Design a protein that fits this description.
Chain lengths: ~260, ~260
């Protein structure tokens, strides 16, 4: 009578840890959701074939409203697994599902998996220099989210990098690209005019982390805003003050303009 | 002709990803480093047994000074693997190694794995709320470093959580405990008197992230500074103002006192 939260990783079914795989193979019932992120290199079949079980995919509503009615009941008499993209507790609200499990008298365990939050290390930017993170959300009707713009400003003033999770509407199969995120940011800059995000701002794009050939690009907005970074998922990063070696990496590995090697201390 | 940077995960030999294990097994040579961190829930022998390859351990100097004379030469005519605890490229000096690979005409690919950076999500604290990260270092001789205290100050001041890595002496296999870290911080608070870290400060301790039975504890320094958090390694987090959902998780899951539901929200 246990519930396992198991991350599947960044790109394909093999990004799962061996610990999670062996545990998943021996669970009675296996559930999962694919609305918190996109694993571009795999399919449900591949996942099912890898763990040797049929997986019941749950919708956001099934989880947020009926987790305790669909999943927990079974966990009271069996060993149940709940699979998610990346790490199950990073930039999701799944952590609260553990409280529900507790209230239903169900023991829960977390099996971590590679996450985009730590994968940013592949950009060459020192991971400890990242500040507050934010999400660039799609404007809805007359509602135009902008708080993520202030997060960048706040981190930039402190010389810290800003990681920007990009929006996702799984049901509409919509995955915000770094380009769309750059366009939204420019529109917010146009209205707020804080000199936070312009055509001359240096940004970094990481696409399909987890795959062997992710797209890692660094450069000025004016040049990257119309560039093709490949299929989603994407994340956008606005670096703060760069260390010489961060700039060297961005140039040598992310194809940034050599001139960023010239750091303004 | 190929060098693989492969993460070993958080705690034991099963924390590597299925993808990382397959690739490691197919490599001609396998190197590893255990100076940036250790795999406390396993041994070199168990890791070597799992991969079925002999693992040549490299020291900090081997890597930082001679990576190109020890690892890259073999990577020119074979498939080589470089294993590191956690997620590759997280340790600040590792990203530069890919530049060294490029300069040597060696292709490199990164195979991610869980990192404490994302695994701390198990504390219930929202990831986007973490600010700049830092390391608590042991004072030595006439050197009393305190920047990690200022980091906590700048983060907390902006409502952000501060992730604190604790000092480690890999070669001597000696870890700084959360208890020791708190003592130092109270000591630093006594000299700077900035009202950042006191007996009433709320803190979270995460130990053995990755294992199925990690220690997640939250409470005030006055009650935790002498509590036994078990075997290392320990991770210390000084949360900023909490969101009610975070506080509820720390209470129900991390045994935090209900007092935080009114005092720290
Ligand atoms: N492989 C990947 N490459 C690029 N961005 C990714 C990614 N996986 C997730 N993201 C980013 O994160 C968003 C989902 S947020 C949920 C993150 C997940 N729990 C994790 O641990 O990674 C996506 O919309 C995208 O912006
Ligand atoms: Na961070």
């Amino acid at each position: 009578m246990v519930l396992y939260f198991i991350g599947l990783g960044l790109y394909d079914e093999r990004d799962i840890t061996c610990k999670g795989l062996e545990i998943a193979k021996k669970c009675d019932y296996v559930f999962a959701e694919f609305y918190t992120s996109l694993m571009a290199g795999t399919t449900l079949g591949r996942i099912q074939k890898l763990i040797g079980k049929e997986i019941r995919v749950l919708s956001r509503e099934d989880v947020e409203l009926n987790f305790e009615n669909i999943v927990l009941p079974l966990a009271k008499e069996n060993d149940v697994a709940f699979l998610t993209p990346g790490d199950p507790l990073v930039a999701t609200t799944h952590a609260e599902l553990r409280i529900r499990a507790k209230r239903a008298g169900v023991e829960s365990y977390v099996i971590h998996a590679p996450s985009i939050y730590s994968a940013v290390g592949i950009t060459g930017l020192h991971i400890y220099k990242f500040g507050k993170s934010a999400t660039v959300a799609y404007p809805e009707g007359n509602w135009f989210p902008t708080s993520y713009y202030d997060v960048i400003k706040e981190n930039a003033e402190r010389g810290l990098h800003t990681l920007l999770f990009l929006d996702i509407k799984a049901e509409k199969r919509m995955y915000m690209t770094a380009n769309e995120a750059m366009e939204l940011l420019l529109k917010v800059e146009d209205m707020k005019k804080g000199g936070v995000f312009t055509d001359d701002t240096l940004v970094v794009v990481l696409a399909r982390a987890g795959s062997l050939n992710p797209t890692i690009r660094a450069g000025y907005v004016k040049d990257l805003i119309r560039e093709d970074f490949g299929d989603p998922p994407h994340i956008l990063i606005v670096p703060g003050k760069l260390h010489i070696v961060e700039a060297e990496y961005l140039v040598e590995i992310a194809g940034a303009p050599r001139e960023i090697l010239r750091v303004n201390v």
